C-alpha cells in the first residue's frame, strides 16, 4: 500500500544474468567493427574478447 512506508514498500528487482562465454555471441555493446587485417601484428577484439 502507499501507507507501507520506505522499507515496507514493494521494490522491483531486475537481475541481469549473462551467458558470458566463448560460445556463439548474440548480444553485444554499442560497438562497431574495423576491417580485418591479415598477416600483420595488431591489437584485436572479437565480441569484446581481446
Amino acid at each position: 500500500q502507499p501507507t507501507n512506508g520506505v522499507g515496507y514498500q514493494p521494490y522491483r528487482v531486475v537481475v541481469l544474468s549473462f551467458e558470458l562465454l566463448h560460445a556463439p555471441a548474440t548480444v553485444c555493446g554499442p560497438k562497431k567493427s574495423t576491417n580485418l587485417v591479415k598477416n600483420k601484428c595488431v591489437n584485436f577484439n572479437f565480441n569484446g574478447l581481446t
Binding site: 562465454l21 566463448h22 560460445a23 556463439p24
Partner: peptide, 24 residues
C-alpha cells in the same frame, strides 16, 4: 529383451574447438 551399452552416449561438453589433445 536386453543388451550391454558398450560405449554409447558420449557427448560434447561445450562449443569450443580443440584438436589433437587429450582432455577430461
Amino acid at each position: 529383451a536386453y543388451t550391454n551399452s558398450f560405449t554409447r552416449g558420449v557427448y560434447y561438453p561445450d562449443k569450443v574447438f580443440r584438436s589433437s589433445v587429450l582432455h577430461s
